[PDB]
């Protein structure tokens, strides 16, 4: 017998003790080795309710990533609550590794295995595990990178689709690569991201059709963000320790619904911290070619309000709440107390 419960989780990883990469260093001191032969019990005739939007596992992972960034990514200058902190800001080795979240004795993790599970409601095909799958703490906005893919159809996730103030998580079932490079050999902060237009437009059209199913067959329109901070209006992410801000106007341009799409990007030293603190300034980019090839596995969308009396619904790429990023991977898990 069991019941829904919150408890202090621990983590597991395959981090290397000799590696200087900061995720490896953090996990070496904060996690245990993974289980090579993890047990999983599939529960027969069991119906369990899940709520990805109210899941303490998300808050706990958030706390890990914050602590990781606090120890690994201290800026030269920090601006918090009127205070000004000036510390050393050396260049680091940065590349996220998978992190497993696990329950202690007396508790287990219930895993929903329903193929098109949207994150809320009952789940039929439920299994029991001690640890989640390996989740890379990839911090980004607009586009979810290097995540897990949906098994069957593209999944739309929201705490309340009718509420346009609630973020929409689109879970892709097909990866689309994004190739971002700050070239080595005039503007050291100038960069770009290349994406195959054929793949992207094909996928975005599939997302369009899926959104129609959730919005009574209304016409789905994509538009670039209207306003706000650069972290939201642009696709922001971290590559090799460097913060990249990319213009995704070409990606959300309804007309193409075939060549290579080259997004204009820039490496920013001054950033609005995703931790919710204030602003921070980092050192200028390292020398040489800075390159990251990522899979786009999900999209964060915000729907416009005031469209009830029209046949259109307008969606714009958004984000900013990094907890939504962890939700996109933790949606199928919940902790129960074994009694």
Ligand X SMILES: Cc1nc([C@@H](NC(=O)C(=O)Nc2ccc(Cl)cc2)[C@@H]2CCCCN2)sc1CCO
Ligand Y SMILES: *[C@@H]1O[C@H](CO)[C@@H](O)[C@H](O)[C@H]1NC(C)=O
Q: Are 149 and 174 in contact (CB under 8 A)?
A: yes
Q: Which does 56 bind (CB under 5 to 8 A by kind): ligand X, ligand Y, none?
A: none
Q: Which does 160 bind (CB under 5 to 8 A by kind): ligand Y, ligand X, none?
A: ligand Y
Chain contacts with ligand X (rule: CB under 6 A): 139-141, 229, 231-232, 236-238, 243, 271-274, 276, 320-321
**Both ends of the chain: CA-CA distance in Å?**
5
- For ligand X, the nearest residue by Cβ is 320
Residue 116 host element (H or E): none
The residue (of 282 and 333) whose beta carbon lies closer to ligand X is 282
Environment class of residue 324 by beta-carbon count within 10 Å: exposed (0-12), middle (13-18) or buried (19+)? buried
Six token digits for residue 179: 């190739």
Which SS3 state, helix, strand or coil, does residue 325 take?
A: helix
The residue (of 223 and 269) whose beta carbon lies closer to ligand Y is 223
Q: Are 194 and 316 in contact (CB under 8 A)?
A: no
Six token digits for residue 334: 């919940």
Q: How far apart are CA 174 and CA 176, in angstroms?
A: 7
Instruction: Kindly state the smallest distance separating residue 298's Cβ from ligand X, in Å.
Output: 15
The residue (of 69 and 107) whose beta carbon lies closer to ligand X is 69
The residue (of 7 and 258) whose beta carbon lies closer to ligand Y is 258
Instruction: Kindly state the smallest distance separating residue 38's Cβ from ligand Y, in Å.
Output: 20
Q: Which does 232 bind (CB under 5 to 8 A by kind): ligand Y, ligand X, none?
A: ligand X
Instruction: Kindly state the smallest distance separating residue 169's Cβ from ligand Y, in Å.
Output: 9
The residue (of 98 and 225) whose beta carbon lies closer to ligand X is 225
- Alpha-carbon separation of residue 191 from 92, 185, 264, 308 (angstroms): 20, 12, 6, 40
Chain contacts with ligand Y (rule: CB under 6 A): 96, 114-115, 118, 120-122, 124-125, 138, 145-146, 153-154, 156-158, 160-163, 173-175, 179, 181, 194, 196, 198-199, 206, 210, 214, 216-217, 233-234, 237, 239, 247, 249-250, 253, 255, 259-260, 292-295
The residue (of 21 and 78) whose beta carbon lies closer to ligand Y is 21
Which SS3 state, helix, strand or coil, does residue 264 take?
A: strand
Q: How far apart are CA 57 and CA 74, in angstroms?
A: 25
């Amino acid at each position: 017998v069991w019941k829904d419960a919150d408890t202090t989780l621990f983590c597991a990883s395959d981090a290397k003790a000799h590696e200087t990469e900061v995720h490896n260093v953090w996990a070496t001191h904060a996690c245990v080795p993974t289980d090579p032969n993890p047990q999983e019990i599939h529960l027969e005739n069991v119906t369990e309710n899940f709520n990805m939007w109210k899941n303490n596992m998300v808050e706990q992972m958030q706390e890990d990533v914050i602590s990781l960034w606090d120890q690994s990514l201290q800026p030269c200058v920090k601006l918090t609550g009127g205070s000004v902190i000036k510390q050393a800001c050396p260049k680091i080795s940065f590349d996220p590794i998978p992190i497993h979240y696990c329950t202690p004795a007396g508790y287990v993790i219930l895993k929903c295995n329903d193929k098109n599970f949207n994150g809320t409601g009952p789940c039929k095909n439920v299994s029991s595990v001690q640890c989640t799958h390996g989740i890379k703490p990839v911090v980004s906005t607009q586009l979810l990178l290097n995540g897990s893919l949906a098994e069957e159809e593209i999944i739309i996730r929201s705490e309340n689709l009718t509420n346009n103030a609630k973020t929409i998580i689109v879970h892709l079932n097909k990866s689309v690569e994004i190739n971002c490079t700050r070239p080595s050999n005039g503007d050291i902060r100038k960069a770009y991201c290349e994406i195959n237009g054929t793949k992207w437009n094909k996928v975005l059209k599939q997302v369009t059709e899926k959104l129609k199913e959730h919005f009574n067959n209304k016409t789905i329109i994509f538009q670039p963000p209207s306003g706000g901070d650069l972290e939201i209006t642009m696709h922001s992410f971290n590559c090799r320790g460097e913060f990249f801000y990319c213009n995704t106007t070409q990606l959300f341009n309804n007309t193409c619904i075939n060549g290579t799409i080259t997004l204009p990007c820039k490496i920013k030293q001054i950033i609005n911290m995703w931790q919710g603190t204030g602003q921070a300034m980092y050192a200028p980019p390292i020398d040489g070619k800075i390159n990251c090839v990522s899979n786009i596995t999900g999209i964060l969308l915000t729907r416009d309000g005031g469209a009830n009396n029209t046949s259109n619904e307008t969606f714009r790429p958004g984000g900013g709440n990094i907890k939504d990023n962890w939700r996109s991977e933790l949606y199928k898990y919940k902790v129960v107390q074994i009694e």
